[PDB]
């Protein structure tokens, strides 16, 4: 009985294509080379994410400072979640599918300084697999991650932001219903999926701690593109000042 197009059908259209890393595999691997290549790939994925965000109806109506703030707070969440999805979709295995030309399997995970990080990232694909998340559920959840963290004192366009966020909570519900599954358990699954969203905060906390550490380490010689370097530089003080507010579904 819906006479309008579904929001999720739009999200399917604006989802950016998978980017290639441009990794040279004719030469032996090294942790430094892989990390640098992934950082450069990340920079381009984040640029693509800006275009994506601007195509979400209402996002461009937010104050420009708010648009900026949301992307600064959630870029890692967005990147890690998409990584989890590609990894989940591509294999059966315990692998990380950063790009079609840069896949990290169990072997490559043994490279120096890579095990713990890959484990934290594999958690996302593990959870998506456990809950058998659908593409439509995934797309709605990814929007909610963009809207998952705000400044301690809120946004300038707080009222419009809240309406947009509620809209995608509703849309996530619609995706659950559209999903081929147990009808009487929709509300339980709603809890489970928003629980997963809550846990992405800790996933991001871990990945950012190591990212910040690497970014500040002058001994490792790992390159960052302008996009990530600017965001990281701007965010480090905020996490220190406690200027952050995670919007949790299941905690105060």
């Amino acid at each position: 009985p819906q006479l309008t197009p579904t929001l999720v059908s739009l999200l399917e259209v604006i989802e950016p294509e998978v980017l290639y890393a441009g990794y040279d595999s004719s030469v032996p691997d090294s942790t430094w080379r892989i990390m640098t290549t992934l950082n450069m790939l990340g920079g381009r994925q984040v640029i693509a994410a800006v275009k994506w965000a601007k195509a979400i109806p209402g996002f461009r109506n937010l104050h420009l400072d708010d648009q900026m703030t949301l992307l600064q707070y959630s870029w890692m969440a967005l990147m890690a979640f998409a990584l989890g999805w590609r990894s989940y979709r591509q294999s059966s295995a315990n692998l990380l599918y950063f790009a079609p030309d840069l896949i990290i399997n169990e072997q490559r995970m043994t490279l120096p300084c890579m095990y713990d990080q890959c484990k934290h990232m594999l958690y996302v694909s593990s959870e998506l697999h456990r809950l058998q998340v659908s593409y439509e559920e995934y797309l709605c959840m990814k929007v909610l991650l963009l809207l998952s963290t705000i400044p301690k004192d809120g946004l300038k366009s707080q009222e419009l932001f809240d309406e947009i966020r509620m809209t995608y909570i509703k849309e996530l519900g619609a995706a659950i219903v559209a999903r081929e599954g147990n009808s009487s358990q929709n509300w339980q699954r709603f809890y489970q999926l928003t629980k997963l969203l809550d846990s992405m905060h800790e996933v991001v906390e871990n990945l950012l701690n190591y990212c910040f550490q690497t970014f500040l380490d002058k001994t490792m010689s790992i390159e960052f593109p302008e996009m990530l370097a600017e965001i990281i530089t701007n965010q480090i003080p905020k996490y220190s000042n406690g200027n952050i507010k995670k919007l949790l579904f299941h905690q105060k």
Partner: peptide, 12 residues
């Protein structure tokens, strides 16, 4: 700050 980000958000 985040000059490239602002640039991308504010462009046609």
């Amino acid at each position: 700050a985040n000059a490239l980000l602002r640039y991308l958000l504010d462009k046609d």
